[PDB]
Design a protein around this ligand. Structure first.
Ligand SMILES: *SCCNC(=O)CCNC(=O)[C@H](O)C(C)(C)COP(=O)(O)OP(=O)(O)OC[C@H]1O[C@@H](n2cnc3c(N)ncnc32)[C@H](O)[C@@H]1OP(=O)(O)O
Ligand SMILES: *SCCNC(=O)CCNC(=O)[C@H](O)C(C)(C)COP(=O)(O)OP(=O)(O)OC[C@H]1O[C@@H](n2cnc3c(N)ncnc32)[C@H](O)[C@@H]1OP(=O)(O)O
Ligand SMILES: *SCCNC(=O)CCNC(=O)[C@H](O)C(C)(C)COP(=O)(O)OP(=O)(O)OC[C@H]1O[C@@H](n2cnc3c(N)ncnc32)[C@H](O)[C@@H]1OP(=O)(O)O
Ligand SMILES: *SCCNC(=O)CCNC(=O)[C@H](O)C(C)(C)COP(=O)(O)OP(=O)(O)OC[C@H]1O[C@@H](n2cnc3c(N)ncnc32)[C@H](O)[C@@H]1OP(=O)(O)O
Lengths: 402, 403, 396, 398
C-alpha cells in the first residue's frame, strides 16, 4: 500500500560537442547508445533482462532520433529485445522528465529497475517539409529543426507570440531588470567555474569517451568542447546582442546549440540489492510549472516553488542548486525571484550551460547527475536541479545523497 | 514513506477518426489535439481549470505541426491557462495509452491531483524530412516520408534486427504463429460488422465531439468516423491482393489504416474528484510494458499483458472487456491464441477496432482506454483490459475497474 | 542564300495551370505535335530531318537535358535526328523558328522542325547545394515562373521586379490606363471566343491523349468575361497600380511544332510551302520595363527588311499583359484596336506556356494570313529581364 | 549572298574541379568573367552595337536559370540594349553557340556577336517534382550535377537510360577499344596538357577569376601531370571489374566559362577587331543513346562531305575527350591514328575537365589558338552529346 523509495545509482554522459563539431558525425540514436553501453560495462552484477524500462528525453525526434529513440538506443546498445523503451519530450527539460517519470514508475510500485537519460544531436537535426495540400501546389518549403519555431500556428502567434528563445531572454532581462553587466558577470563566472572543474578532473569523472573514425585512424572525444576558458569581462563586453543594439542577450551570455547524451540507473531498494548496485541518492520528487511563453525563462520559479512547498523544504536548505543556464538573463532572474544571491556558492559550483553547452534532450539528465556528483564530492546532503522550457514552462527535481 | 493514492478516470472524449487525405486532413495536429481539450472544458463546468497539474499527450511523429511538445501547444490553443504544464510521450502506436498510465503514476505517487491524458496523430499531415549535408557541395541529399514506418535507417539496426515494415512484421507473425489468411479475413469481417452495429447504435456518437472544417460558403462539421467499411464481405476480403507480394497474407482489408484523430480524458485523485465535482468512472489498476523481436512486433501485447496481470493477480479471463488493438488481424489473432482467449470471444473488441475504425498512432491508445471504460458502463462489467502492439517490438497493457 | 518555307504546323490545346494537361510530362507533351507532323505528312522521308529546334524556358523538370532530343525520340523519329533546345524565356519558341530559318538560309540544312513546349503545372522546385557541412541554410524555390536564385548584383543594378511589377512600370511610364487595359483584355476574350466557335483553333489543334481521356480544346478562355467584372478585380501589386489577373496572361501548359524547308526539300518531300520566312530580329530594354522589348526588335527587323509596320496584314503581338501590349502598339503607331492586331485574340484569353507561345504566334499568324488572303505577317513578343523578339513571314 | 564570318578575340576562365577552386562562383557571375575580359581586351568596340550574346548551358536549373546569356551580359556591364539567348545541346552547347552565331551573321541577320558557354557543375541544384495529388506521399529529390533525372519510363524501355560512363563502356565493348589503349590515350592527354601548361599555352587563353576574402584563380585545376601508365593500370572501372572505363580515362565534373567575338568583315573594320579565322560550317548528327560517344562520327561525315574537305586536310582536330573509349573509337571510324599528331596536341578533357556548357566553346577557341601557333590552315572541333548526338565545327585561319 505504501510508496517505495527510489535510488539513483550509476550515472554517466558523453562529452558535450559544439554544433558541427566533435560529435557532429554521430547519429543521435548511436550517441544515445554510448552511455547505455557504458552503464552495461560499469554495472556487471545487473541481470540486464530485468530492466523494466528505458526512459529517454529528446526534444526533436524528426531525425535519426525518430520513432522512439529510447527503444532504438537500447537495441543499438546491446540490451535484450525484451526491454521496453519510451521517449519523453518537454523540450530542454526532456531529460529531467525522463528521471522524474522513471522515479514515479518505481515509487508507485509498477517497476523495480529502470534507466533514465536524454539525447540530442542538434548538429544533425533535419529539415522538414510539409505535404502539399493540393495537386501541383506552388507552396512547398523547407524548415530547419535545429532549434526554435517551425510550422508556426497563426493562432499561437496571435495569442502568445512566437518569440525566439533569445527574444524571450531579452524579454526576461527587460521585465525583471537584469542588466547586461550582470548577465556578463554571471557568464564569466560560469566559464571560470567550468574551467576549474575541467582542470580538477570533475567532468572526466562523469564522462565516457566517444570513438570517431578519421581517414588515417581513430580518435577519442574525451572533453567538453563548448568551454571558453579564456573568457574575460572585456571579451564579453565587446559582443553584440543577438537581437539588436538596444538588447542584452549575446552569444557569450547564452547557452549554445550542442550534441550529447547521458543516462543513469534508478532502482528500488530490492533492485539495488539484487543487482549489486551502489545506491547514491534517493529521489525526493519532481514538479512542473507553466508561465507565459514570451518569458519562458522564469518558468523554474513556479516549478521550484511547487516542489519545495509540497516537500516542505526551503530553497535555502539545498546544498547544491543546478540551475540550467539557457541564458544569463533568466538564470539571474530565477535566482532573484527565489531570494538566492546572483553568485551564491551552492549554485552551479562547476559552471553550467553557458560554458558546457545544452543539447536539449540531454541537459536535464546532465543536471540531475552532476548535482548528485557535486553532493558526493562536497559532502552535501540535498540537491535541487531545475530548468526552463520553450513555450513557457519549468521543471524541478530534488534528490538526497544516501 | 506514505500511502499510494487511488486514481480515477473521469470524463473522456475524442474526435472522429478520419481517413488519410480525408475529412480531417486540413486540420493541424496541434489544433486537432486541442479539440478534445476544449470539449472537456465545455463538458465539466465544475472544474477549476487552473488546478490542472499536467497535460500528458501521446504523439508518435513530432516532426510536423505536432513539433516541440504538442501537449503544451494544444493546451494553450485549447484556451487552458498558461500556468498549466504539458509533456508529450512517444511509444509509437502505444503513445496515448502511455499518457494515461504515466498520468496514473504521477497521481498514485502523490505528485499530482488533477491531470489530463490523451493523444493525437495527424498522419495525413506528417511531413517529409531531409538530413543535413555532411560536406560542402554534397551530392547526397534525400527526402523521406514520415507518415509511418522507417526513415533514417541505421545500418546497425538493419543488420541486427532488420527494418521490416509494419505489414512485413504482420506477415512474419502470420507465418511464425500460423495465422491463416482465412482466419485473418474472418477477424477483419467481424470488426467491420461490430463497428457498423456500434455506429448505428450511436455508441461512437457518445464518445465523439465534432471537428470544425474551413469551407467556402461556411465551415462544416465532421461528426462520424470515416474509416468504417460497413458493407465489407468475406468475398471482398478474399479477393484482395496481399501488401507484400503474392505468397503473403496481410492485405489492406485485414490491416488497420493510416488515419487522423485526437482524444483526451481527466484523471484525478479522490480529493480532486470531490473538489472539482467530477464523476469518478473507473479506478486505474496499473500499466505494464514488454519487449519482443522487432520482426514480430505484433506479439508485443503478450509479455505486457502477462507482466501486468501477474503483478495484479488477475487472470486474463477475469476481464469483462478486452480492448485489443487491431494493428493487423494476424497479430490480433496471434495474441489472443497465446493468451488462451478464443478468436471470437464476446468480451474482445465488442464494438470492433482499428481495422474498421483506423488508427492515428498517438491517439489510438487513449481511444482504447476510454472505449473500454465506455463499454464497461454499457455492459455493467467490472474490470477491463486495454492492450496494444508497438513498432520495433513492444507491447503495452493497462487495466481499469468501473466505479 | 536560300529561301526558307514554313510548311505544316500544329499545336496541342493550351491547358490551365493544374488543369487538363497537368498530368502530361513536358517531354511527352513536346512529342505530341511531333507525332502529328509525322502522321500528317506521309510524303516526308523522316530520316532526312536535319534538326529539331525547340524552345523551352525552364529545363529543370521532365523538360531537362535537351527536351528537343528527348521529344523527338519519344515521338518515334529515328535516333539519327539531332535536337537542340533554345531558351529566350517567353520568346523561346519564336527563337526556335528563327534559328531554324537561319540554318536553312545559310545552306547548312534543308529540312527541319521548329517548335516549343512548356509544362508550367509540372515545373519543379529547386534547392541549392549546401555550401558548408551541417549548413542550416537550405531552401526550396518554385520555378513555375519568375525569379529564383536571385543574384544580389542583379537586384542592386537592375532590380528583380516581378513580371507583373514590370507591367505596372510600363503602364506608369507609358501612361496606359486601367480602363484601356481592361478594354483590350475584353476584346481578347471576345475575339478568342469567336475564333473558338468558328473552328479557327480546331484547325491548329491536335488532341492530347491521356491513358483514355482526350484533351482537344483551349482551356484558359473566359468568354464569360465582362468589362464590369474586369473593373472589380484588385491590382496584383496594390490599389495605386493597374495590372490584374484579368488583364494579364496566365500560367499554362502546351506545345507546338512546324516544318521548315528549302525549295529543294519542299519538292523532294511533297510538302505544301505555306509562307516564306523573311527575317527575325531581337532587342534589349531595361528589365524593369521588359514589356516594351518588342519595340526595338520590330524597328530593327522592319528597318533592315525595308518594310513599314503598316505593311503587315496581320500582327500577332504576344499579350503578356494588356499594359505592355498597348504600350507597344502605341509606340509603333498602331491603334489600340487595329483590326489586323490579334484578330483571334491572344494570351490573355488563350494562356501562355512560355516555350510554346512564340511558336504558336508564328503558326497562328500564318493561319490568319491564309484565312484572310493577307501577304506579310509579323509575330512579336516581350521577354523577361528586358528583351523583345520579332519575326516576319510572307504567305506564298 | 552569304556573308563571310570571322572569329576574333576569344578568352576563357580556368577549369575548376567539382567542389574546387571555382565552387563558390555563381554560374551567371562565372559566365560574366570572359565577357568583361572581352570588353577589357577589345578597346575599339562600340559595345552597344553587339547584336546578340549566344551562350551554351546544359543545366539551367540553378543560378544559370532563366537565360543565363542575358543574365551574364548584364552582370558583365554590357549595355541593357544587347539581347541574349541560351542554347542547350548538353556537352556540345558551347559549340552550338558558335555555330548558331555563325549562321546569324552568314545569313545577314547580324554583324557583331558574342558566342560562349558556361557550366557550374559544383553548384548544380537538386530538383523536386510538384505533388500530383493533395497529401502526396511521393516527393523526391534528384541531383542535377550530371546525367539522368526525372527518367521517362518510355525512354528507358525503348532506348535505355545508361549513365554516361556506361555508354562509354558500351562503346569500348561494341567497337573493341581495350583498357590498355584507353589508358595510353589518357596518359598522352595528361602529358600533352602538362607540357602546354608549362609552355604558357593555356595562360594565353585564360583570364583569372577573383574570389573575395582575396584569391586569384589562374590555372586549370583538373590536370594530373604526375599520371603514369602504372597508376592508371591500378584504377578500378566505374561500372565493375569486367568493364574498362575508369575515373582516370574519363573527363571529370567541372566548372568554367568561355566566350569569343564573331563579326562580318564590315564589323571587323568598324570595331577595329583582329579577324583570326573564317568559320566554314557546323553539322550535327544523331546516334543510339546507348553508344552516345560515337556521335561525332556522323557529325564529322555530314560536315566534311558538305564542305568537300577530307578529315586528313585538317591541320588540327580538337576531339572532345568525354572518355578515352569514345575518343579512340571516333578516331578509328574516321581513319585517324590513335596518336596522330594533329589530334588534341595540347591534351583535352581527360586532363583539363569538361564543364558541359563551356567545353564546346573551349574546343573552338583552342583549335584556333593551335592553328595560330603551328601555322596550320584548317581546323576541326567535334564532340559527343548525351542521349546520342555529335556536333562538328570547321574553321580556317585567315
Ligand atoms: S535549455 C537550452 C536551450 N537552448 C537555447 O536556448 C539555445 C540558445 N542558443 C542559441 O540559439 C545560439 O547559440 C545563439 C545564442 C543564438 C548564438 O548563435 P551564434 O551562432 O551567433 O553563436 P556562436 O557562438 O557560434 O557565434 C557568436 C560569436 O560570439 C563569439 N563568442 C561567443 N561566446 C564568446 C565568449 N565567451 N568569448 C568570446 N567570444 C565569444 C563566437 O566566437 C562567435 O564569434 P565568431 O567570430 O563569429 O565565430
Ligand atoms: S497501432 C496501428 C499501427 N499502424 C499500422 O501498422 C498501419 C498499417 N497500415 C498501413 O500501413 C496501410 O493502411 C496499408 C496496410 C499499407 C494499406 O495502405 P493503402 O494505402 O493501400 O490503403 P487503401 O485504403 O488505399 O487500401 C488499398 C485497397 O484495398 C481496398 N480495401 C481495403 N479494405 C477493403 C475492404 N474491407 N473491402 C474492400 N476493399 C478494401 C481499398 O479500397 C483499396 O483499393 P482501391 O481501389 O485502391 O481504393
Ligand atoms: S509571354 C507570357 C509570360 N508569362 C507571364 O508573364 C505570366 C503572367 N501571369 C502571371 O504571372 C499570373 O497569372 C498573375 C498575373 C500574377 C495572376 O496570378 P495571381 O496568383 O496573382 O492570381 P490568380 O491567377 O490566382 O487569379 C486571381 C483571381 O482572378 C480571377 N480572374 C482571372 N481572370 C479573370 C477574368 N477574366 N475575369 C474575372 N476574374 C478573373 C481568378 O479566378 C482568381 O480569382 P479566384 O477567386 O481566386 O478564383
Ligand atoms: S563532354 C563531358 C561529358 N561529361 C562526362 O561524361 C563526365 C564523366 N565524369 C564523371 O561522371 C565522373 O567524373 C566519373 C568518371 C564517374 C568519376 O567520378 P569520381 O567522383 O569517381 O572522380 P574522382 O576524381 O573522385 O576519381 C576517383 C579516384 O580516381 C583517382 N584518379 C583519377 N584520375 C587519376 C589519375 N590520372 N591518376 C591517379 N588517380 C586518378 C582520383 O584521385 C580518385 O581517388 P580517391 O581515392 O577517390 O580520392
Amino acid at each position: 500500500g505504501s510508496m517505495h523509495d527510489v535510488f539513483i545509482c550509476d550515472a554517466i554522459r558523453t562529452p558535450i560537442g559544439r554544433f558541427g563539431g566533435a560529435l557532429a558525425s554521430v547519429r543521435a540514436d548511436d550517441l544515445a547508445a554510448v552511455p547505455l553501453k557504458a552503464l552495461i560495462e560499469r554495472n556487471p552484477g545487473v541481470q540486464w533482462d530485468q530492466v523494466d524500462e528505458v526512459f529517454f528525453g529528446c526534444a526533436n525526434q524528426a531525425g535519426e532520433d525518430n520513432r522512439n529513440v529510447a527503444r532504438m538506443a537500447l537495441l543499438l546498445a546491446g540490451l535484450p529485445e525484451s526491454i521496453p523503451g519510451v521517449t519523453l519530450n518537454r523540450l530542454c527539460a526532456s531529460g529531467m522528465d525522463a528521471v522524474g517519470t522513471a522515479f514515479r514508475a518505481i515509487a508507485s510500485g509498477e517497476m523495480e529497475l529502470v534507466i533514465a537519460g536524454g539525447v540530442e544531436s542538434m548538429s544533425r537535426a533535419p529539415f522538414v517539409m510539409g505535404k502539399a495540400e493540393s495537386a501541383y501546389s506552388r507552396n512547398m518549403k523547407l524548415e530547419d529543426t535545429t532549434i526554435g519555431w517551425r510550422f508556426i500556428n497563426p493562432l499561437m502567434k496571435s495569442q502568445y507570440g512566437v518569440d525566439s528563445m533569445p527574444e524571450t531572454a531579452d524579454n526576461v532581462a527587460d521585465d525583471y531588470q537584469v542588466s547586461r553587466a550582470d548577465q556578463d558577470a554571471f557568464a564569466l563566472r560560469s566559464q571560470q567555474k567550468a574551467a576549474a572543474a575541467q582542470a580538477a578532473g570533475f567532468f572526466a569523472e562523469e564522462i565516457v569517451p566517444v570513438r570517431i573514425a578519421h581517414k588515417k585512424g581513430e580518435i577519442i572525444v574525451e572533453r567538453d568542447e563548448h568551454l571558453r576558458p579564456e573568457t574575460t569581462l572585456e571579451a564579453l563586453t565587446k559582443l553584440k546582442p543577438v537581437n539588436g543594439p538596444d538588447k542584452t542577450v549575446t552569444a557569450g551570455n547564452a547557452s549554445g546549440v550542442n550534441d550529447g547524451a547521458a543516462a543513469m540507473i534508478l532502482a528500488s531498494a530490492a533492485a539495488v540489492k539484487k543487482h549489486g548496485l551502489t545506491p547514491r541518492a534517493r529521489v525526493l520528487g519532481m514538479a512542473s510549472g507553466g508561465v507565459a511563453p514570451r518569458v519562458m525563462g522564469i518558468g523554474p520559479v513556479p516549478a521550484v516553488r511547487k516542489l519545495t512547498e509540497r516537500l516542505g523544504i526551503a530553497v535555502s536548505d539545498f546544498d547544491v542548486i543546478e540551475l540550467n543556464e539557457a541564458f544569463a538573463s533568466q538564470g539571474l532572474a530565477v535566482l532573484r525571484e527565489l531570494g538566492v544571491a546572483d553568485d551564491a556558492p551552492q549554485v552551479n559550483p562547476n559552471g553550467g550551460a553557458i560554458a558546457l553547452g545544452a543539447p536539449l534532450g540531454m541537459s536535464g539528465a546532465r543536471l540531475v547527475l552532476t548535482a548528485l556528483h557535486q553532493l558526493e564530492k562536497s559532502g552535501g546532503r540535498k540537491g535541487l536541479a531545475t530548468m526552463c522550457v520553450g513555450v513557457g514552462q519549468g521543471l524541478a527535481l530534488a534528490i538526497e545523497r544516501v
